[PDB]
Design an enzyme around this catalytic site. Structure first.
Site, PDB file in Angstrom:
ATOM      1  N   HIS A 404       0.931  -1.343   0.006  1.00  0.00           N
ATOM      2  CA  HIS A 404       0.178   0.234  -0.339  1.00  0.00           C
ATOM      3  C   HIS A 404       0.546   1.136   0.125  1.00  0.00           C
ATOM      4  O   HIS A 404       1.007   2.137   0.999  1.00  0.00           O
ATOM      5  CB  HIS A 404      -0.775   0.312   1.309  1.00  0.00           C
ATOM      6  N   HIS A 406       2.337   5.269  -1.239  1.00  0.00           N
ATOM      7  CA  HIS A 406       1.527   6.283  -2.033  1.00  0.00           C
ATOM      8  C   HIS A 406       2.728   6.665  -2.757  1.00  0.00           C
ATOM      9  O   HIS A 406       4.398   7.214  -1.674  1.00  0.00           O
ATOM     10  CB  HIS A 406       0.671   7.117  -0.888  1.00  0.00           C
ATOM     11  N   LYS A 487      -6.923   1.052  -8.367  1.00  0.00           N
ATOM     12  CA  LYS A 487      -6.528   1.342  -6.941  1.00  0.00           C
ATOM     13  C   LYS A 487      -8.251   1.599  -7.025  1.00  0.00           C
ATOM     14  O   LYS A 487      -8.088   2.561  -7.069  1.00  0.00           O
ATOM     15  CB  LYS A 487      -5.745   1.630  -5.810  1.00  0.00           C
ATOM     16  N   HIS A 489     -10.844   3.935  -5.086  1.00  0.00           N
ATOM     17  CA  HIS A 489     -10.847   4.262  -3.558  1.00  0.00           C
ATOM     18  C   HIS A 489     -12.026   5.725  -3.521  1.00  0.00           C
ATOM     19  O   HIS A 489     -12.216   5.764  -4.811  1.00  0.00           O
ATOM     20  CB  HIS A 489      -9.973   6.098  -3.564  1.00  0.00           C
ATOM     21  N   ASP A 491     -12.629   8.442  -2.651  1.00  0.00           N
ATOM     22  CA  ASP A 491     -12.509   9.898  -3.231  1.00  0.00           C
ATOM     23  C   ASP A 491     -12.486  10.030  -4.609  1.00  0.00           C
ATOM     24  O   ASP A 491     -12.452  11.176  -5.494  1.00  0.00           O
ATOM     25  CB  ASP A 491     -10.729  10.651  -3.139  1.00  0.00           C
ATOM     26  N   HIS A 516     -10.614   0.745  -1.636  1.00  0.00           N
ATOM     27  CA  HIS A 516     -11.017   1.994  -0.652  1.00  0.00           C
ATOM     28  C   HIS A 516     -12.503   2.304  -0.112  1.00  0.00           C
ATOM     29  O   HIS A 516     -12.930   2.677  -0.990  1.00  0.00           O
ATOM     30  CB  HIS A 516     -10.087   3.532   0.489  1.00  0.00           C
ATOM     31  N   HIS A 542      -6.321  -0.918   4.544  1.00  0.00           N
ATOM     32  CA  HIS A 542      -7.098  -0.483   5.842  1.00  0.00           C
ATOM     33  C   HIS A 542      -8.432  -1.347   6.227  1.00  0.00           C
ATOM     34  O   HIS A 542      -9.304  -0.316   6.376  1.00  0.00           O
ATOM     35  CB  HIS A 542      -6.497   1.401   5.831  1.00  0.00           C
ATOM     36  N   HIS A 590      -9.549  15.319   6.704  1.00  0.00           N
ATOM     37  CA  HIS A 590     -10.235  16.339   5.735  1.00  0.00           C
ATOM     38  C   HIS A 590     -10.852  17.679   6.117  1.00  0.00           C
ATOM     39  O   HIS A 590     -11.813  17.608   5.517  1.00  0.00           O
ATOM     40  CB  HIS A 590     -11.212  14.892   6.942  1.00  0.00           C
ATOM     41  N   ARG A 606     -15.625   7.204  12.467  1.00  0.00           N
ATOM     42  CA  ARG A 606     -14.324   6.655  11.433  1.00  0.00           C
ATOM     43  C   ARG A 606     -13.364   5.988  12.140  1.00  0.00           C
ATOM     44  O   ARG A 606     -13.024   5.320  11.665  1.00  0.00           O
ATOM     45  CB  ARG A 606     -13.567   7.616  10.721  1.00  0.00           C
ATOM     46  N   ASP A 630       0.400   2.269   3.791  1.00  0.00           N
ATOM     47  CA  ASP A 630      -0.281   3.492   3.202  1.00  0.00           C
ATOM     48  C   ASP A 630       0.308   5.081   3.798  1.00  0.00           C
ATOM     49  O   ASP A 630       0.278   6.051   3.682  1.00  0.00           O
ATOM     50  CB  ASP A 630      -1.101   4.337   4.624  1.00  0.00           C
TER      51      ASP A 630
HETATM   52  F     F Z   1      -5.667   6.218   4.166  1.00  0.00           F
HETATM   53  F     F Z   2      -5.496   4.730   2.184  1.00  0.00           F
HETATM   54 NI    NI Z   3      -6.903   4.340   2.034  1.00  0.00          NI
HETATM   55 NI    NI Z   4      -4.037   4.641   1.317  1.00  0.00          NI
END
Ligand code: F
Ligand code: F
Ligand code: NI
Ligand code: NI
Ligand code: F
Ligand code: F
Ligand code: NI
Ligand code: NI
Lengths: 837, 837, 140, 140
Positions: A404, A406, A487, A489, A491, A516, A542, A590, A606, A630
């Site tokens: 994982h 980024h 992936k 996500h 978002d 995710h 996660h 956020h 969360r 992550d």
């Molecule tokens: F994350």
């Molecule tokens: F993540």
């Molecule tokens: Ni995530």
């Molecule tokens: Ni991530």
């Protein structure tokens, strides 16, 4: 100033020492790293003053810090501090041996040069483990068993000393030794491998010799007795002995016999387990404490035949015609042998030599020379053209695989490999907002650029595209461009239409999908995302959900057969600071406001102590199969391995041995947990035949650890058979170990060497087009495969599928109707004893 | 923080200043490097406070440190400290000129911002050399001798100033000067090269002009008089003068004549030796002190013709149609000229320009423009397309060649080149135990990887395989793979069978063999290893034996004709700390125990004051031919050059001038010793036609030194004609010299430029296969040759073959029956005056 | 007829009037390197099993009459890395006299049969006008 | 512009050129017997020249691609030695940009008889029974 590189580094060392000095001065008990920094700086500073000799400083340096000024583990971890400095007579090396030798240090010396007030001794605030300690039965081992033996009196007629090593062919020794050469024929010293017998001029010593074994061929030395051991060659040898004037005297009554298991046999040589472990690392039945954790690994089996250990150095085993073979084809020499490794791997905790050839693990077993040793297979031959890496006393594991990642900046790469990671899977383009949020390299032009960008770095890479699409069209393009995964996500949208389309695409391309999920429950609850999987293999990132997912019950996916679940590392394990830290991190990520009721309600939905507590237990019972970073998007790239071990240590302290564990060791739990960052990531993403374990045929991506730093800071990271990064000290110094010792890039990082040691994992579609040629990549490329018929049952040692419920109001988690609770830990190992900050 | 690179560096500078401040505060007298750090930091800190102007700080900075707060050499070494800082009005440069100007500094200012207690002045503890000083006869030189001359009155009719340089064609000057232009024709100013005459508006000055020489062709300026000097062109020129309105007035009685050697000739211009040396560096008969050693180099000859020195800058010689030639084919311009170099080389200590072309030393002699200068050969023409490196006041040597390199990490490479090393020969694969112990790249796959790994580094590399084999088979393979040598080591077995087989292989492949002999005397004493050589050429590493060899008499090999002997650097020279330091290092390397009688007896047999003392004397008389590092395996990669010079300085202090020396200089000893790290390594290993000396036809691997830092920290390292590494200050600064000044990589290290400047040396067998193509190497490859007919007599200036005996009990060393003694030195030069730590 | 001619024999060059006499021969009669079924260059016979792999010849041209400005001789020609490695008597030192260690025929050696043929250097034309590519083909 | 140029004898103009020059180098040309003392003795045939050997052909020519393709550097992706350039300026063209062929007569075609007219006038020409640049030149 005209500063040379070493001057710049020594300034750095001095600054670490001064930090350690300020800390000392307020009464901090220094950890191992602070104590080295301080002692080494003080040695340089005394050298600068020009009034102290090397010998004086060897003494002064043991007076600086007392047991009461350092943490309880320091006197155990710290054996020597070395540094070089400019004395009035030029650069010299000082070794301060066993520096923590008193209760109380001479704090005025510890603080010399600092101008800091000397603290009174009561400022230092009042049971502890030995990190990496070896536990041994109180027993002796018998060497070289089952051989012909003779005891010969050997007299030196030389005027200079003569010293003869364990595996030197005894008839070939210096002509100025006199003994029965006829009886020394085909024999060698019955002494611990790598040790020697010293003959001062005129001395007589009796020695026990045992026959050489294997094919019994003598090579090298003085070419007195060259050839297979037999009567004809014995006669030729004795003729050469007389002809060449090598000292010989018949010893008609020399005792002869055999070695046998028998404590009373006068031919036997014995070695206590404790000393055998100091010389060779431990052997079957011995245990090792992993770092400063509570976990004990027992050696399950050992390939060695005691007495014939491959140990390299002066006088030692790995020498021409001795441990180093003269009887085999050049093309079958090993490229490298790692000798005497404790292997920790999900397949077992064993003791073995590791043969490396063409960048691959060629063999695991007993290495050396079949001409003088039994048990050496023809794929573990050490030849002239073989390099040696010394594994005695060390643990060797596969390199970790973080799936994982980024790709937010290049610096996390360096951070990752210096911690023991050799494979990265994830996505990103650099620090774009898309990447900061999600593991996605969205554009084919970025897939090209990322592959070119990383092409000289010595790690294996996989890049994932953006799978968040309801249409297949663009997904085919990013996969053909090099994506080895996608992936999804929230978002970019993790709705059932995107999920299903993305999975259908995976079914066709034989790539893994990472998800995710929809935190907001916008389009559905977790059972609606599970329905959209339609039974198809998927990897949930996660899975506990602090890092993202259906609030508050995403962790249910850990009971879903077609789900491969991972954790990310910052919730590992639940500790006192976890919830405060994570709540605020989430608000930062956020852009949320503590003063807006809905924002805070979002965050509390969360970040949940009960699911995070449950996640400790799920990992422990093998219902979460992988741990991952992550990196810089809620987790920590250099903590994949240490968070794994801190979770195991926590669960052992709170729940005791696993069902499946013995009660003398933690092997099962150790194998379960190492699988979380080695083999399971490779299985999940489709490249387990190349990496992810210490097994023959795979890439020799291997990491060396001192047991006392296991799980925290490795010694050296080997990439495709070549050292890529390693601890190394002052580059100008007379040896490799004087301060400052830092993890540093090695030859595997220069020129294009990195590409020759690694693989970029891509899709089948991409390799069918030869993306490696299109993109001018020097790194090897292989296609990922066999990821669309996986279930939780294929996750090694983490194949549990409890039915998971989560109360939607209280968030209470249950597995098969039982509460999953664990309290928070107030401390973790692999932290305070090791880190400067 | 958003730190930019310069902020990160300035923090580093500030930390060095604070180290210097703490040291000041306990009464240390600061060395040069500490004093720069402190003054530069304090300037930044006063700037931060915002109350002091640039002009104020120029003054304040000279008040910080007194003569009593710094070492005796500091007021000599330190001319200016520069730094830039953010004032309230933005970044400004401050130069503090001559900062050590008082007896006692204002220590409250020296300590400003530090919060350290100000020490009282009696805390600073009470004859010294000027490092790099120039010694000159008290005499004047006569410029531009043997030329037609005229004295002309020149009046400015301009309203702005007009300044005219030494080599500008005088008829081409600004039209607003009025003088006899007819008599200025083909003439230039008879003034020191690179100086100028200034005319304020309305001023009249008389000037002496001399004729231009060489082919006498005028080019450039105003194109008034363009063409060869002759009557026709003179008339055309005067026509253009009138036509174009350039000021002209006949001066019927202007005195005319010639320049001649004659102190009374009114046309002559003279310059004192002292000023000539300040402008151009010194010339024939002048002497130079090397660093802070006791050694004096005398310039033996000078190619310059006084008055026509190639000096580059505004108003100066190297300008279009003046010193910079307009009359030659473009393809014969030099790529680069290093002007006015003092060359120190085993071939001689001379003064010359150095022409560089296609990465090679094209010419050594007098450079410039044949159209206006005598003595310029057609291979030393400076054209439009020529770069200039200014050598005036500097010494230039070949880059050093370290032929005992253990390739333990990449960082020693950087350490090596920043010290003046441009060629590495040795072996290793990174920090494997095999490499940590021995100079061996054992496997063909590692030979490939090491060559690919180093392919973009700007140094020449040679890799050696493992020669410790009784069979030829594997040796052929490692040699075909790229090995340019083999290194027999006792740790892999250095027995007579291995020795002889390895040498037979060398005979066939025309590669050099390097040996670390059998310390243990296991298979034989030193005379038995010498017999196994069978008269064949071999290079003995660390011949004195502390670094390894037959105990205790390996040093006997220095009398063996077919032996090429080297020293490694950490025993150089015998000083007070040497034995304590080396005994303990050996115990660390060998894991030995002070409490075990045999272990300590081993160490004492190996670390011996008498052989190390003998080794000082052997080096001095030329019986040891090479000095080398043993980098990180007992020796120090950045000390090859300084250890060499510290040995020479020691021997001069203890034994006076060599037989062969004059008594006015140390030239012979200087030439003998520089040969130890330049030409002899290249001869021994078979590549002396490419590198190893400042001679025409060789690679322009060249190092620039200030005499005051000679032997310690060079200015710039030139690799194949391009700057590879150099001292450079704050990258953001207005000029290249403000703090922090550090040795840094230059353009020769970026992209693949490094390969275009260097050579990887391989065997003939390897080049016959084109290993460079097989391995995709961008660096040039050449085969080593002519190493199997070498004897000690081929080691330049180190061809001594004394008969050496060593008492086996007392270890007393004799050469031709005479004791080799030297006491230990208590201090060495090239250390305390230069190093921060 | 079997090996090409040996010392003292003469050869007419083409249909010219010129006669070349073999000046010397490196062969030891009886141990000629001849390759084919039943023949000399076979495992452990003329083809050596006792030497390091890296010293096998790449190719041997066996039994060549060499015509060269240095002499008209009879010899085997060893080829290695594209170079003439040795000229003399080739084969296996384990069963033949006179085989130098640069003329060893190993498993990894190709054979070109020179018996009955003449071998010369390739010609070098140093007045070539590069008028078309086809003269290149004509030349070689 | 590129020196893509063709040489013709007036007597063979329009039929068989002497030599075709590609980017400044002869690519193909009439040349006779490669062994002959001069370049012109039979058989004279049109033959490939140095511009066709090795990678010389790519150094003399251009592969025309789209802008989109060049923006991606297709020449690098595909390891092409030939130069690549993008075509452009083709979307604002009309018949008026065709050099010396910019006529725009109104054309009608009878759908039954197929009679063609330009601005109302018949476009007729009878068939030719012979053409030049044929029988005088071709072997077949
Ligand atoms: F994350
Ligand atoms: F993540
Ligand atoms: Ni995530
Ligand atoms: Ni991530
Ligand atoms: F050494
Ligand atoms: F060494
Ligand atoms: Ni050595
Ligand atoms: Ni060494």
């Amino acid at each position: 100033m005209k500063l040379s590189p070493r001057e710049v580094e020594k300034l750095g060392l001095h600054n670490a020492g001064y930090l350690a000095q300020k800390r000392l001065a307020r009464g901090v008990r220094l950890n191992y790293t602070e104590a080295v920094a301080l002692i080494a700086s003080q040695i340089m500073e005394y050298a600068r003053d020009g009034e102290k000799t090397v010998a004086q400083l060897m003494c002064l340096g043991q007076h600086l810090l007392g047991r009461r000024q350092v943490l309880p583990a320091v006197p155990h971890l710290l054996n020597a501090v070395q540094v070089e400095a400019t004395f009035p007579d030029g650069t010299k090396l000082v070794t301060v041996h066993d520096p923590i030798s008193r209760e109380n240090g001479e704090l005025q010396e510890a603080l010399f040069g600092s101008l800091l007030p000397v603290p009174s001794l009561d400022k230092f605030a009042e049971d502890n483990r030995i990190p990496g300690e070896i536990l041994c039965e109180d027993e002796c081992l018998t060497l070289n068993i089952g051989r012909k033996a003779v005891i010969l009196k050997v007299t030196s007629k030389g005027d200079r000393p003569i010293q003869v090593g364990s595996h030197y062919h005894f008839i070939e020794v210096n002509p100025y030794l006199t003994f029965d050469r006829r009886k020394a024929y085909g024999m060698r010293l019955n002494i611990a491998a790598g040790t020697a017998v010293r003959f001062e001029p005129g001395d007589c010593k009796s020695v026990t010799l045992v026959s050489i074994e294997g094919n019994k061929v003598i090579r090298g030395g003085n070419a007195i007795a060259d050839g297979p051991v037999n009567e004809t060659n014995l006669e030729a040898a004795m003729h050469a002995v007389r002809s060449k004037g090598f000292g010989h005297e018949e010893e008609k009554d020399a005792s002869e016999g055999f070695t046998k298991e028998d404590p009373n046999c006068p031919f036997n040589t014995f070695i206590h387990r404790k000393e055998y472990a100091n010389k060779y690392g431990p052997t079957t039945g011995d245990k090792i404490r992993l770092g400063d954790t509570n976990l004990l690994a027992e050696i399950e089996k050992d390939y060695a035949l005691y007495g014939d250990e491959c140990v390299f150095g002066g006088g030692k085993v790995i020498r021409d015609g001795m441990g180093q073979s003269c009887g085999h084809p050049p093309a079958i020499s090993l490229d490298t042998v790692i000798t005497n490794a404790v292997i920790i791997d999900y397949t077992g905790i064993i003791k073995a030599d590791i043969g490396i050839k063409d960048g691959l693990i060629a063999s695991i077993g007993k290495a050396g020379n079949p001409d003088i040793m039994n048990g050496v297979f023809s794929n573990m031959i050490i030849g002239a053209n073989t390099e040696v890496i010394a594994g005695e006393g060390l643990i060797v594991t596969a390199g970790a695989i973080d799936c994982h990642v980024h790709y937010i900046c290049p610096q996390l790469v360096y951070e990752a490999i210096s911690s023991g990671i050799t494979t990265l899977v994830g996505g990103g383009t650099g620090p774009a907002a898309g990447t900061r949020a999600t593991t996605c390299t969205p554009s084919p032009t970025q897939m090209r650029l990322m592959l070119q960008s990383t092409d000289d770095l010595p790690l294996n890479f996989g890049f994932t595209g953006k799978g968040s699409s309801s249409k297949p069209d663009e997904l085919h393009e990013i996969i053909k461009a090099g994506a080895m995964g996608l992936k999804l996500h929230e978002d970019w949208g993790s709705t059932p239409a995107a999920i299903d389309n993305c999975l259908t695409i995976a079914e066709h391309h034989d790539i893994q999908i990472n998800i995710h999920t929809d935190t907001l429950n916008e389009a559905g609850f977790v059972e609606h995302s599970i329905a959209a999987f339609k039974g198809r293999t998927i990897h949930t990132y996660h899975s506990e959900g602090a890092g993202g997912g259906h609030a508050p019950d995403i962790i249910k996916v850990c009971g879903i057969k077609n789900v491969l679940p991972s954790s990310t590392n910052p919730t590992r394990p639940l500790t006192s600071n976890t919830i405060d830290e994570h709540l605020d991190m989430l608000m930062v990520c956020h852009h949320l406001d503590r003063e807006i009721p809905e924002d805070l309600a979002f965050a509390h939905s969360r970040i949940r102590k009960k699911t995070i507590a449950a996640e400790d237990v799920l990992n422990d019972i093998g219902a979460i199969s992988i741990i991952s970073s992550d990196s810089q998007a809620m987790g920590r790239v250099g903590e994949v391995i240490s968070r794994t071990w801190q979770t195991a240590d926590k669960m052992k302290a709170q729940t005791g041995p696993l069902k499946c564990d013995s009660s003398d060791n933690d092997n099962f739990r150790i194998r379960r947990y190492i699988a979380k960052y080695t083999i399971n990531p490779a299985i999940a993403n489709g490249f387990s035949q190349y990496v992810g374990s210490v097994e023959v045929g795979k890439l020799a991506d291997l990491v060396m650890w001192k047991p006392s730093f296991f799980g925290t800071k490795p010694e050296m990271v080997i990439k495709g058979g070549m050292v890529a990064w390693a601890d190394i000290g002052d580059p100008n110094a007379s040896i490799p170990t004087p301060e400052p010792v830092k993890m540093r890039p090695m030859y595997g990082t220069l020129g294009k060497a990195g590409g020759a040691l690694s693989i970029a994992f891509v899709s089948k579609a991409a390799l069918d087009q030869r993306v490696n040629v299109l993109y001018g990549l020097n790194k090897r490329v292989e296609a990922v495969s066999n990821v669309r018929k996986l279930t939780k049952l294929d996750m090694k040692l983490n194949d549990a599928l409890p039915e998971i419920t989560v109360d939607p109001e209280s968030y209470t988690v249950k597995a098969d109707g039982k509460l999953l609770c664990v309290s928070e830990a107030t401390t973790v190992p692999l932290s305070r004893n090791y880190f400067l900050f």
